[PDB]
Symmetry: C3
């Protein structure tokens, strides 16, 4: 290839490596904001026509993102204060990024997950809502969408599918999630979604389980991967 072909090929390859970093950074930054109950910084990560999906409900735009992370999560955990605050733990450990940039470099998908250690210390337990566990673990999978807007990566769709909860004292095997897929929309429900997902995308919560399909192709076999050939070797 010519020097011009090689320079252009290197520019495209280096942009894709930068894109992957930038998308990972959005999720890791998102984590550090939500650990502090700081919904503004979270809302700022989104494209203006973006959305967040939580318990099979869509929260649209800056308004929806502030309703979920502010009106609901902040009022629940800190009584409507930017955190962190005395005795309140809400650590959403973020990991295991598998990001796929579209061929055109203008959109992307990414799989991630979180494990949360949460709760109210004995010092502040009188501030905990009746009905909330004092201390708990949660984990869920993210399958998110991203857009590159005027050369900046932003969150287009954050889709958090909670997978399991555990009361600290009892564990996942003895815990039922009280949170269930959304049934009531905003404004009837002041902390509810703009719209429910379609029935085919509605997920029941722990201990109910459903696959979250991979946004990534099989990294070795791509579309050549077929389950059945391998299954023949199992007993």
């Amino acid at each position: 290839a010519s020097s011009e072909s090689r320079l252009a090929a290197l520019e495209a390859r280096v942009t894709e490596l930068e894109d992957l970093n930038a998308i990972r950074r959005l999720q890791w930054a998102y984590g550090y904001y939500i650990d502090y109950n700081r919904p503004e910084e979270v809302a700022g990560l989104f494209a203006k026509d973006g959305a967040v999906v939580f318990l099979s409900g869509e929260y649209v735009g800056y308004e929806g993102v502030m309703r979920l992370y502010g009106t609901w999560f902040q009022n629940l955990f800190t009584g409507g204060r930017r955190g962190p605050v005395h005795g309140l733990l809400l650590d959403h450990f973020q990991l295991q990024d598998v990001i796929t940039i579209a061929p055109d470099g203008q959109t992307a998908k990414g799989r991630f997950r979180g494990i949360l250690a949460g709760g109210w210390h004995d010092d502040i337990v009188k501030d905990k809502p009746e009905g909330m566990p004092q201390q708990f673990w949660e984990s869920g999978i993210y399958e998110n969408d991203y857009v590159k807007e005027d050369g900046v990566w932003k969150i287009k769709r954050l889709d958090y599918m909670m997978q399991w909860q555990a009361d600290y004292e009892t564990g996942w095997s003895k815990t039922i999630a009280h949170l269930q897929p959304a049934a009531v929309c905003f404004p009837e429900n002041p902390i509810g979604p703009d719209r429910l997902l379609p029935e085919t995308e509605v997920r029941q919560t722990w201990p109910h389980r459903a696959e979250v399909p991979m946004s990534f192709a099989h990294p070795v076999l791509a579309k050549a991967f077929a389950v059945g050939e391998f299954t023949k070797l199992q007993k």
Copy 2:
């Protein structure tokens, strides 16, 4: 240097950054497959002359990988069903990659680790084998080998060295691993390895401990690192 020297140097540097991403992606993808008890997708990540090492035993090729992840782990946790399934948690959180690409770019090593949250919900506990903990934590270190085959990175050797287990209710300090280094080979043992490791590589399990040497050089001092100079400053 000439434009040709600079282009070739940039091509090699950008390939090495892509190689590191690709190798990390194999381990993160491996994780998301094993969380769903999907052994086929796991087997597909391996070179055909690859192997997996588990409890000081080698399982060779697609056949061995399907025996460990299918005949053993899938039959144990889901009764031989592709997951996920109701009430069954098997989340192997993957992290802390330190990858070393060979100078020739055709092989690699990588250190990783996993922490597992596992168990049977009360809803399905009657499906749990007698003798298994209802709910547990495990963690282990991976020191893996990779090959670049026809321009695609694949797993050559996955070596998972379990380090500790904890019953959920009691913790690591009160838990003994029932799993011990392999003693019986397939086919006598229908879920056993093709071959045992050599005695010098056999690891006893928690609370027994043994170092897993680092596949990476000291990242600041490389071969110039010597323990004793520093030890002089400790009291």
Copy 3:
């Protein structure tokens, strides 16, 4: 742009991607060393005029780093032996890197965090100091400084701000940290810091909380981010 402008721009972009990898590798390598109570390898990661900060106290140079990781942590957990050792767990799971390289490429900052699973098995509990929990969780945030010295990235300042502790049996909501911000300097205190932080940087420990400001700019809005505009949308 000319071929020369494009080559130089690509060299700078590829160096920045390599820099980010190298800085992440320091923290991940640091983790694997401290899990083995190997302070020498930790000390080797530091610039000679580097420091480590722990409980609002600065430990300067190789001498200080060996005092904290050797004289204190190694003597505490393994009785002054390089690990790992029978029945002693000290796994500092490292994750969630957000690294910012200075424009000149000669320094960097990075946010990270750790979650620790620690303790003495029943087999060795008679070796545990009176007053230590047999088994516990801890987590903290790192905001670190790095220098590129003769083309090698090194730790200039490791600042570990412990955020929460939990006795295994009781959880974070029922645990008070016994560790408090440093009050006594070395040499009066044989395991104490060279210097205390200034009062304005002193942190009280769990369940006391204080923000650890982000070393990174808002990744979408940068300095254009303002909290108040968004807060208007919350109820």
